[PDB]
Design a binder for this molecule. Structure first.
Ligand SMILES: *C/C=C(C)/C=C/C=C(C)/C=C/C1=C(C)CCCC1(C)C
Ligand SMILES: *C/C=C(C)/C=C/C=C(C)/C=C/C1=C(C)CCCC1(C)C
Ligand SMILES: *C/C=C(C)/C=C/C=C(C)/C=C/C1=C(C)CCCC1(C)C
Ligand SMILES: CCCCCCCCO[C@@H]1O[C@H](CO)[C@@H](O)[C@H](O)[C@H]1O
Ligand SMILES: CCCCCCCCO[C@@H]1O[C@H](CO)[C@@H](O)[C@H](O)[C@H]1O
Ligand SMILES: CCCCCCCCO[C@@H]1O[C@H](CO)[C@@H](O)[C@H](O)[C@H]1O
Ligand SMILES: [Cl-]
Ligand SMILES: [Cl-]
Ligand SMILES: [Cl-]
Ligand SMILES: [Cl-]
Ligand SMILES: [Cl-]
Ligand SMILES: [Cl-]
Lengths: 242, 242, 242
């Protein structure tokens, strides 16, 4: 009744995005039929990868493959108990968020050196966040990993709001880039907040069902809506892009 | 006598490609002495990586490091039993098949945006195939991962037969690209067929020794012969390439 | 008293580089304030990643997350015993050493095809070294993985001393590249020597505390000093770089 409820929250939060990522893929494929070869097409290709990885991630979680139990260390609000960790989320982020950055990079026509550094920071962010969730020896080390993950996040964010914006300005896409960059910054910021507030961090919210739904809602925006906005603009501005 | 036989199939299927990848490396190194710096040399470098990763993979399997037992879920032809899974194959594919795609990409002088999307799809293909083999909770999830892996495969294939062919046409290598692309498409198609027919899928063939040999034969062609054909052509057409 | 000592060696060898990587990051960030957008800035960005990954690695080891016990196989000097393996080092090398190569690649303005092949070889080097440490079935397979790792290392080294030097010559950075390339070759050579001499290889040195310190000292030079030299030169030669 709390377990019926917690289990009902968890499964619905996962099955919803299997459906939505599935539909996004179908929609995005259809939209690509009318998109002309060249830069518009390259962006579409990168963009389509985003829900492809996302739906994989959610099947990872649903199947039990990428979900485990983790013993919280002394000092944690749930010290001495096992908590369900959806570590599959952090893992697949390391592949899906570089696809987001690649679509943006193509859109803003960034320097390849900047692209490689950003994607590398992004992967560091994801792996250290995973380390934070997986660490059981001490509460200190969990939050130390969280802080390093934040430092990686700052590298990515800084690049977006400076060099990538600059690149977009001279590539003639600064207006759509700024929309998407603002969307990206706001929504990505939600993930470390969920982590911190949720059961793996401070556990202000102790329901893993609630924290799971929080990530799932963020994904709807940071992936599927982000991508739909991108593809709509590209399909309407193919010459600006080429 | 079935176990003597199954064990004889397994070890021979693995030791043969330690030998063949070993020899391929030796041959390819020798061939590189006569290849001129620049684009020909870059292709040679990428090409040489292919059997380097391959021989690593086979030592992974031989040593027991990347082989495990997996319990088949209800509904599977071998439901309730443990089957030997050569999961090391899927793992190293995620590094060796991007090397194949990189050699082709250099040959066809493709757009870097296309290259990054293709290699990302390729990695998604490999990791979801690995997920399919590793999933034990339900038969549904195994085949769902298989279907996503196929979708990633289609992304890669589509890029080959369209944009990469286009790139090869304007880079003056469309004739050798078309040979290699056709080789690649036909042989790569064999892997999901082996998976499906073999013990991890439908188990029409229940011998892991037989399924292992099937992958090993595919590797001989998709890697070592593919690469030897590439290097022969490059060493004979260095100016067309430069 | 040997355990007090071995444990004192181990923890000090790990905490020292948490401190030093931490300080390097702080120093490098400060130095970046005075570095002009463009190629100098791109190098700085790539360079800053190096201690970011390094400090992550050391927290991985300190927390117990990426340290495990491994049973040495028959024939090993410590056959039948469990030895502490800092496998987290090999793992994070697969992300930090591509950042070193990326900073150099930007500095020498190398061909992207060369860059991708080198970074791929570099990752192969790291993963097969990890395989070597993780392999328990036979002593033969441990050293076979070590030899393949060496072959990957040779690919990387060959590229540095030939094509990358060539690129640096025509990009006008051959003098600073040659310093850094020589630094890189000498210090990187120290790692397989430590492996071989230390407890995981021949165990001429059986103290894991001593072997850990050896890696930690190599890191100080191959990462933090390497990077400080790079940033000093870039900040003093911004026009040569642009
Ligand atoms: C599609 C998935 C997305 C856009 C996920 C983005 C995730 C992040 C920006 C996560 C950030 C984190 C930190 C910055 C600190 C450590 C905890 C994390 C991993 C949640
Ligand atoms: C050198 C190794 C090669 C060329 C391996 C290629 C492997 C594939 C094309 C595998 C494809 C698969 C699917 C498309 C569905 C899921 C099962 C796989 C991973 C066998
Ligand atoms: C910052 C970390 C660095 C620069 C580490 C570099 C590590 C190597 C060059 C390791 C090389 C190895 C071999 C060449 C053989 C197998 C054992 C290794 C992994 C130590
Ligand atoms: C996100 C910015 C603040 C980070 C918190 C610093 C680490 C504190 O750590 C927290 O201490 C609490 C006990 O006091 C517990 O309730 C939490 O479970 C534990 O994570
Ligand atoms: C490859 C295209 C067809 C995929 C098969 C769909 C999934 C069916 O699944 C299969 O069902 C069988 C029992 O009927 C078993 O024999 C198999 O082990 C099991 O994989
Ligand atoms: C690094 C170049 C030499 C590699 C050594 C070849 C592999 C030998 O292997 C070694 O054999 C010894 C027993 O004779 C043991 O002391 C070692 O633990 C074992 O690694
Ligand atoms: Cl994802
Ligand atoms: Cl869950
Ligand atoms: Cl392989
Ligand atoms: Cl096997
Ligand atoms: Cl590291
Ligand atoms: Cl340790």
């Amino acid at each position: 009744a709390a377990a019926v409820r917690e289990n009902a929250l968890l499964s619905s939060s996962l099955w919803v995005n299997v459906a939505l990522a599935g539909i996004a893929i179908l929609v995005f494929v259809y939209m690509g039929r009318t998109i002309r070869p060249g830069r518009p097409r390259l962006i579409w290709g990168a963009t389509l990868m985003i829900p492809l990885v996302s739906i994989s991630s959610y099947l990872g979680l649903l199947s039990g493959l990428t979900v485990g139990m983790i013993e919280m260390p002394a000092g944690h609000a749930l010290a001495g108990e096992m908590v369900r960790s959806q570590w599959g989320r952090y893992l697949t982020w390391a592949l899906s968020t570089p696809m987001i950055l690649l679509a943006l990079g193509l859109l803003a026509d960034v320097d390849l050196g900047s692209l490689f550094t950003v994607i590398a920071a992004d992967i560091g962010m994801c792996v250290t966040g995973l380390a934070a969730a997986m660490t059981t020896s001490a509460l200190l080390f969990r939050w130390a990993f969280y802080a390093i993950s934040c430092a990686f996040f700052v590298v990515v964010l800084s690049a977006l709001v400076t060099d990538w914006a600059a690149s977009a300005s001279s590539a003639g896409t600064a207006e759509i880039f700024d929309t998407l960059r603002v969307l990206t910054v706001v929504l990505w910021l939600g993930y470390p907040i969920v982590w911190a507030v949720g059961v793996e961090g401070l556990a202000l919210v102790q329901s893993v069902g609630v924290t799971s739904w929080a990530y799932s809602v963020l994904d709807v925006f940071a992936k599927y809506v982000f991508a739909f906005i991108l593809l709509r603009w590209v399909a309407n501005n193919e010459r600006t892009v080429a």
